[PDB]
Amino acid sequence: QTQQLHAAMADTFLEHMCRLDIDSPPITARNTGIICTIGPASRSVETLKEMIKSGMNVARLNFSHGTHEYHAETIKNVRTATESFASDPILYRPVAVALDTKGPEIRTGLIKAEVELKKGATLKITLDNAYMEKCDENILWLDYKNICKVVEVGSKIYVDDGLISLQVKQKGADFLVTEVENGGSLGSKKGVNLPGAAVDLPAVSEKDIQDLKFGVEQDVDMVFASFIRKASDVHEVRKVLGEKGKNIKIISKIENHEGVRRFDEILEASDGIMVARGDLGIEIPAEKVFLAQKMMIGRCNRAGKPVICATQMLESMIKKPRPTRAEGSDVANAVLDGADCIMLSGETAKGDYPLEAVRMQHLIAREAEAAMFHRKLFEELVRASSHSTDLMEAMAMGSVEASYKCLAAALIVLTESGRSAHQVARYRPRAPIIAVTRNPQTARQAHLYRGIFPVLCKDPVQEAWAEDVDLRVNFAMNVGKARGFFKKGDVVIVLTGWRPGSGFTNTMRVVPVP
Amino acid sequence: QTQQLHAAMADTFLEHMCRLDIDSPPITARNTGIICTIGPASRSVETLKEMIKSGMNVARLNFSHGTHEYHAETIKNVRTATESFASDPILYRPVAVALDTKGPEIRTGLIKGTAEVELKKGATLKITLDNAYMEKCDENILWLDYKNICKVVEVGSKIYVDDGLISLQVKQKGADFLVTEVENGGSLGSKKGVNLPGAAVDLPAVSEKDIQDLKFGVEQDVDMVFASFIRKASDVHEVRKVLGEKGKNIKIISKIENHEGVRRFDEILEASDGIMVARGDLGIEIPAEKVFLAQKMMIGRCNRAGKPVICATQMLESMIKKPRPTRAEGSDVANAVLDGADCIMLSGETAKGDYPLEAVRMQHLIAREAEAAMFHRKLFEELVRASSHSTDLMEAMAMGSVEASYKCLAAALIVLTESGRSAHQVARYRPRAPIIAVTRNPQTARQAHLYRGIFPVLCKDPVQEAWAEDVDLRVNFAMNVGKARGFFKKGDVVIVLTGWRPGSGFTNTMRVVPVP
Amino acid sequence: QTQQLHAAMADTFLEHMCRLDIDSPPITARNTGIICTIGPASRSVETLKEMIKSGMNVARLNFSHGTHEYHAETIKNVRTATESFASDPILYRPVAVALDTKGPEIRTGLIKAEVELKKGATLKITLDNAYMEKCDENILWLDYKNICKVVEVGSKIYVDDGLISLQVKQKGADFLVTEVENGGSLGSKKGVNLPGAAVDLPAVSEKDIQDLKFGVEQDVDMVFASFIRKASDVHEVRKVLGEKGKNIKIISKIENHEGVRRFDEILEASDGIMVARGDLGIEIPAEKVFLAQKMMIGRCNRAGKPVICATQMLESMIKKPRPTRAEGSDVANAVLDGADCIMLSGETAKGDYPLEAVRMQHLIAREAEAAMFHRKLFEELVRASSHSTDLMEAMAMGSVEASYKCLAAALIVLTESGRSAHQVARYRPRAPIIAVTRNPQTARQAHLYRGIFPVLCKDPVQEAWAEDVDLRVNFAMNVGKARGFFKKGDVVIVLTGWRPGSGFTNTMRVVPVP
Ligand SMILES: [K+]
Ligand SMILES: [K+]
Ligand SMILES: [K+]
Ligand SMILES: [Mg+2]
Ligand SMILES: [Mg+2]
Ligand SMILES: [Mg+2]
């Protein structure tokens, strides 16, 4: 049987596992969005074309590095690589452009060769600007000007992926005599974390403002805002984006202990959430990170808002053509948990194997997608939002229940603002959601939701609403036919608008593929 | 609330996720077993004493390498480090010794004296069986152990070298030679693993060498055998036969490493004492993506059957060179225990790694954070559902006790067991509270580490004449253990499972008692 | 298969029904308690002996009728009929004696032949005491002195089982001109109900006080207090019973709209509850009574306190040897809902067929008992009290789960105060609960709980606690053996006390029948 449909009939989660067949092939569609950070390894147009073919949906731009000239060239190269498919809009794949803010991060200065720090040695950290290019095994410089007024005596300091640990012995004006717990080699510009400390740095600094404002004029689809701790942080980001960029989605990166506590207010203020395991792993104990990841993914699915699982999902692929078995189960678990999107950061930025990692997330994703207990998950998603008496949610729940029953090949949704297709997605159909649109911005943003395959209609608006409905539908039929989701003789569910002035998608049809 | 007790009241699995609290601190005890494979980095008594403190439960011995003298020394070192704690039985931790067979593994020869040859894309690589090339492997020529390779391999067939990192496609065939094309390159070192998917290798599951290693384990008195590349139930029976009368108590963990192992899992499972999900070799015979499907399939089925399932291979791989794991490795351990893994394994992290102690510490840290994050109530109901066609008396005692421990939030379940059968049965229904299994039998104590939740304590005290006093003694011994380990203080509630009389056959009496 | 054990394996309530086999014979045990009101038809010792044989557990005495000489003779006849079995304590069945209070009921006077009242006629109700023996189609007398200050103009008055309806046209000092809605024949002493009115009569009148105090010196086991509306009502009943009769159980009859609203405070104040469908059916609309019945039975099972379903369960058996099909499904539904006890009132008081009705409730009960989805009900009962971290509840849940698994023949409980066996019962084992005791009062009260078969041990207390445990157990083994619950080779669960000073029953044993 296809798509683990035998394991679908389980009624017990234990019995659901026991039935999972490796001989059971998945469907050709792949619901989980792949987000790739474009660095030196993947920056060229020749490479960026290949990534879209390999399964790239959203291109991330990290603004912790590079200039504004630099990233503008990257965003230009994305669009060039994307439009080189627009000649035939059937096969065309919308590709979103994402901007990730730097955030209030703490970094180091330059070395006078990577400096070795021995276990149980004496170190001193001075904030003097004459030590910007003079760092070794005794002297070090940091960005955080007001570090002394927040750091206490006997506090742990983590430098560079939390691999180097320090403990403060002496406190001063701007000097800190620190004792090394576990050392190692030390390069330049290495990140610094402070777990158990109240970082009073701005949520959005003047650099972040200009990073965001650059995103508005460059026409970015979404933003990954860094180190969010409360609601006022998200509001400021929206305040910076203003009326010009109100439609730009705000995905909120949860990277610290405070962001986990106050997740409820951050999620309602945001369009999406990012589980930043990387930084989170240093900020909270590394073995608690899986707890929060499931806590956040659970509530984002429950709220009907996008969630991205990020960082180190395929690390070993920076230097190897194959991932580890730990990296393989993690990517699967991320989608089994319910995450809408999976992010690659570093494997696609610097790695020797950019393509392999994207193809790998694509192969793992659609295996785990079928491995989900849909019917049992659907009931829980209904239960969780049973207070809501929304009309579109009713249209969505009905369409998904019908897609489970007749084992439909897809769900065709005619959406303009995207809001209708998003609702179908939050109730997780097993089949893909072909969401036809004529709004470019809507098409690109649609990748943030599990299941939605967006297609931009490049045909003119018909006079009669029925013909304009019928022409968009056959288009979506042609997309599934061409991409191979279905064929004539198969069955699909179609969500349209009854008349031009219907707010949401209010008409459901069970129709065979023509 | 303490140990995710808020997420335990969820009634919905989605609600259960949404209720997980990072500030909800777990209990002291750690239920999931930790298997460490002992190599150069961990072989010293001094290092071995530290790992026992760090929470090593089993010591795995990889018989793919080393002479019989070498492993006999590893064994001696492990038992010495274990006996170092035998001065105080209350604190004493019994560590298991596991023998891992070489099995039918295909490996390359040695490279010429770059030191490691570079294979390039599209390049040609000749494979030879001529023993003159045993150590003369280079970019043009390669040697393999499997003298019969060309009888099982065809034109177009894929050959994988060194943990599936180097891919070869057969272009010319011969009697004792192969001409292949490199599909994707990499550096080629000495004595590397070779995999042949789709091919049906006619190598023995138990070879002449395997017998010598298994006969060695019997006299060395190993506690379990990790049987490599088991493909069918007739493979298990041959290991069982080799162990024979003298090795009858040695448990057989069957390693599932190929497509045939998975297909015929049902017959392998009921024939084996336990199963190991050998992710490494498994993820080369079948597509790497399909591996999590096999893992979950195997864990579930073993949990349903009440046999130990071990998760193995590349769990904390980055901890070989780095003192902190990657994020994918962190969640991998967690999800393995959240799946229902009786035990978790470390291969390279403790054998060759720079940070063996940190690797045993991280697994111990993740594991108990995941044991509380489980959805116990729902799992219990489903395990009960699955086994309802059985009406075994011991199974009921186990179900009553675990139900009882959920209600009064018991701190521990004390079990008096001679063969382990009773403790194993309580463990299979997966209580939240640790299971303290008092045993006078040393080998029973060591093998008990295979099962989730069982904290084996060896009693050195003599047999009392009156059964009632003998029972109390062993319970009192168990009580002090909880106090000393910090599992529970005075006032706390435990479940005590005992035999009513010497000829009970199982732990037929259950009591709820407060700690004195 | 026995006992609907195929339907036991369902996992779906729908699939649970579909599997119910009429060819599936129940076990010999019968968990549901049968309560019988002893009137003229059943008053004689010769008849009362037969009722115990037929399945009588609790004898109800209605104090709305008769004198104190009268009921003392009934209670004397019960004990005589009971003790005539005590020669062999193995086969002996404890029989409880119950006292039901009159309550603040409103009745009529005497007729000057039953008076016919025509539909749409003129009537006048006067409170003058010279009309006590003078009633007809125009004049009527009532008990309620302050009726005018609570009755409004255009209010409905129901007289005699709510079969005669009236509507007030004129209000006065003590005269009420009422219009007949639907009439009929009218006898003497007929009850009167006032739905939608605030009856300010005492909860316990001086008659009720002397009814209760008579119960104390006569040594009654429980009390069915009438027309309870709040917590102060139950407290007054306990206040009247005092220290002399503190161990006498207070079962609270819910008969009015107010008692349904304030059920939560009444249940916690009471030992038990009685669903008085009869009076309730007039006080609230007759078609809403099934709602409340399930509401009360649900919460009583959830609270772990006894609930009795009462009145008109087998009405047609007053004049016929066979009940109706409506009466047959109702008795079954009462036990399927979860009621601990089922009451006969009028079928056993006046009926031409006292024995047949008791045997009929016994036959229906143990059929419906097996028809319950135990495993699914057990999980819900655990879920409902999952906040409670009680030790005895833990002992109970463990013992019941073990009785489900090995399909045990019974649960042997060594209880003195009864409290231990009651806890096993609240979690509903499928097998009977043989609860051994040496407290007569405890044995009799134990019938108020589904499953408990109480046996009074008439053997002397042994010196060694183990021998005193072992001698009570073999006794309980002999009871099940004799009564036919089990045989040697079968398996049972045994709940004992580890040492003499263990508060609850703390030791569980799976032991084969010797
Ligand atoms: K960043
Ligand atoms: K091996
Ligand atoms: K009454
Ligand atoms: Mg970050
Ligand atoms: Mg292997
Ligand atoms: Mg009444």
Three-class SS state of C334: helix
- Whether residues B225 and B80 share a domain: the answer is yes
* Segment (H or E) for A240: helix A231-241
DSSP B174: -
- Whether residues B230 and B350 share a domain: the answer is yes
Helices (H), B58-191: 68-83
- Whether residues B193 and B239 share a domain: the answer is no
Which residues does B347 contact at the CB level (< 8 Å), separation at least 6? B37, B62, B280, B312, B313, B314
Total CB pairs under 8 A between chain B and C: 79
Residue A225 near residue A238, CB atoms below 8 Å? no
* CATH number of the structural domain spanning residue B47: 3.20.20.60
Provide the β-strand partners of residue C58. Answer: C35, C96
Of the partner residues A18, A292, A377, the one whose CB lies closest to the CB of residue B301: A18
Rounded to a whole number, what is the distance in Å from the CA of B380 to chain A's nearest CA?
10
Q: What count of residues does chain A have?
A: 514
Residues in B closer than 8 angstroms to A381, CB to CB, are: 14
Rounded to a whole number, what is the distance in Å from the CA of B46 to chain A's nearest CA?
20
Query: A290 to chain B: nearest residue by CA?
Result: B331
Residues in C closer than 8 angstroms to B513, CB to CB, are: 498, 506
Please give the angle made by the CA atoms of B95, B97 and B100, to the nearest 5 degrees. 145
- Which amino acid belongs to residue C304? G
Name which of C97, C104, C34, C29 is nearest C308 in CA terms. C34
* CATH number of the structural domain spanning residue A190: 2.40.33.10
Residue C469 near residue C509, CB atoms below 8 Å? no
Long-range Cβ contact pairs of C15-22 (< 8 A, separation 24 or more)? C16/C373, C16/C376, C20/C371
Write down the experimental method used for this entry: X-ray
- Whether residues B256 and B333 share a domain: the answer is yes
Contact call for C507 and B509, based on CB within 8 A: yes
Cα C275 to ligand 6 centre (Å) = 10
- Which of residues 117 through 136 in chain B touch A, CB cutoff 8 A? none
User: Mutating which of B6, B18, B187, B269 best tests the A interface, going by the most A Cβ atoms within 10 A?
Assistant: B18
Residue A52 near residue A95, CB atoms below 8 Å? yes
Of the partner residues C391, C401, C491, the one whose CB lies closest to the CB of residue B403: C401
Residue C158 near residue C181, CB atoms below 8 Å? no
* CATH number of the structural domain spanning residue A410: 3.40.1380.20
Contact call for C491 and B381, based on CB within 8 A: no
State the angle between helix axes of A289-303 and B327-339 in degrees (0 to 180), rounded to the nearest 10: 80
Contact call for B279 and A325, based on CB within 8 A: yes
Q: How far apart are CA B369 and CA C485, in angstroms?
A: 48
Cα B105 to ligand 2 centre (Å) = 8
Name which of A359, A362, A355 is nearest A44 in CA terms. A355
Provide the β-strand partners of residue C496. Answer: C507
Q: Is B421 a residue of the active site?
A: no
Query: C380 to chain B: nearest residue by CA?
Result: B11
- Whether residues B365 and B290 share a domain: the answer is yes
Of the partner residues B323, B336, B370, the one whose CB lies closest to the CB of residue A182: B323
Name which of B477, B503, B499, B475 is nearest B422 in CA terms. B499
Cα C49 to ligand 6 centre (Å) = 27
Which residues does B271 contact at the CB level (< 8 Å), separation at least 6? B233, B236, B237, B254
- Whether residues C242 and C294 share a domain: the answer is yes
Rounded to a whole number, what is the distance in Å from the CA of B468 to chain A's nearest CA?
40
- Whether residues A172 and A321 share a domain: the answer is no
Helices (H), A246-324: 257-261, 263-269, 277-283, 289-303
Cα A120 to ligand 1 centre (Å) = 31
Contact call for B292 and A22, based on CB within 8 A: no
State the angle between helix axes of A289-303 and A374-384 in degrees (0 to 180), rounded to the nearest 10: 70
Which residues does B438 contact at the CB level (< 8 Å), separation at least 6? B414, B415, B416, B417, B457, B459, B474, B475, B477, B478
- Range list of β-strands (E), A329-485: 341-344, 411-414, 433-437, 452-456
DSSP A280: H
Matching residue, tokens 């109706």: C324
- Whether residues B184 and B323 share a domain: the answer is no
DSSP C66: S
Residues in C closer than 8 angstroms to B403, CB to CB, are: 397-398, 401
Contact call for C390 and B396, based on CB within 8 A: no
Provide the β-strand partners of residue A222. Answer: A98, A249
Q: Does A326 touch chain B (CB under 8 A)?
A: yes
- Whether residues B135 and B98 share a domain: the answer is no
Contact call for B317 and A324, based on CB within 8 A: yes
Cα A226 to ligand 4 centre (Å) = 6
Residue C256 near residue C229, CB atoms below 8 Å? yes
Contact call for C391 and B511, based on CB within 8 A: no
Q: Is A122 a residue of the active site?
A: no
Which of B370, B390, B420 represents a domain boundary (last residue)? B370
- Whether residues A214 and A169 share a domain: the answer is no
Q: How far apart are CA A367 and CA A24, in angstroms?
A: 9
Which of B177, B204, B231 represents a domain boundary (last residue)? B204
Q: How far apart are CA C35 and CA C26, in angstroms?
A: 22
Contact call for A290 and B370, based on CB within 8 A: yes
Rounded to a whole number, what is the distance in Å from the CA of C412 to chain B's nearest CA?
14
| Ion ligand 1 contact residues with beta carbon within 5 A | A 64
Cα separation values, B392 from B389, B495, C477, Å: 9, 20, 22
- Whether residues B142 and B80 share a domain: the answer is no
Rounded to a whole number, what is the distance in Å from the CA of C391 to chain B's nearest CA?
6
Matching residue, tokens 């999980």: C379
Instruction: Render the burial of B425-449: b for 16+ CB within 10 Å, e for the rest.
Output: bbbbbbbbbbbbbbbbbebbbbbbb
And the tokens for A495?
């969500």
Domain range holding C143?
A: 104-202
| Ion ligand 5 contact residues with beta carbon within 5 A | B 257, 278, 281
Provide the β-strand partners of residue B124. Answer: B181
For residue A198, the tally of other CB atoms under 10 A from its CB is 9
- Which of residues 372 through 401 in chain B touch A, CB cutoff 8 A? 373, 378-379, 382-383, 385-386
Cα C244 to ligand 3 centre (Å) = 24
Of the partner residues B396, B401, B512, the one whose CB lies closest to the CB of residue C406: B396
Total CB pairs under 8 A between chain A and B: 213
- Whether residues B227 and B346 share a domain: the answer is yes
Helices (H), A131-195: none
**Largest Cα–Cα separation, chain C:** 80
Q: Does C510 touch chain B (CB under 8 A)?
A: yes
Cα C105 to ligand 3 centre (Å) = 8
Cα B102 to ligand 2 centre (Å) = 5
Q: How far apart are CA B84 and CA B52, in angstroms?
A: 11
Three-class SS state of B145: coil
Nearest ligand by distance to the CA of B276:
5
Phi then psi dihedrals of residue A199, to 5 deg = -70, 105
Provide the β-strand partners of residue A309. Answer: A275, A342
For chain A, how many structural domains are there in total? Answer: 3
State the angle between helix axes of A354-370 and A45-54 in degrees (0 to 180), rounded to the nearest 10: 20
- Which of residues 297 through 316 in chain B touch A, CB cutoff 8 A? 297, 299-301, 303-304, 313-316
Q: Is A253 a residue of the active site?
A: yes
List the chains bordering chain A where 3 or more Cβ pairs fall under 8 Å.
B
Catalytic entry in B240, B255, B264, B446:
B255
Helices (H), C86-132: none
Rounded to a whole number, what is the distance in Å from the CA of B166 to chain A's nearest CA?
9
Cα separation values, B128 from B69, B108, B132, B161, B489, Å: 32, 10, 9, 15, 67
Phi then psi dihedrals of residue B467, to 5 deg = -60, -40
Matching residue, tokens 């207990």: A373
Of the partner residues B304, B313, B334, the one whose CB lies closest to the CB of residue A14: B304
Which of A340, A368, A396 represents a domain boundary (last residue)? A368
Q: What count of residues does chain B have?
A: 516
Of the partner residues B391, B407, B493, the one whose CB lies closest to the CB of residue C397: B407
Q: Are strands A164-170 and A175-182 parallel, antiparallel or unpaired?
A: antiparallel
State the resolution, in angstroms: 2.8
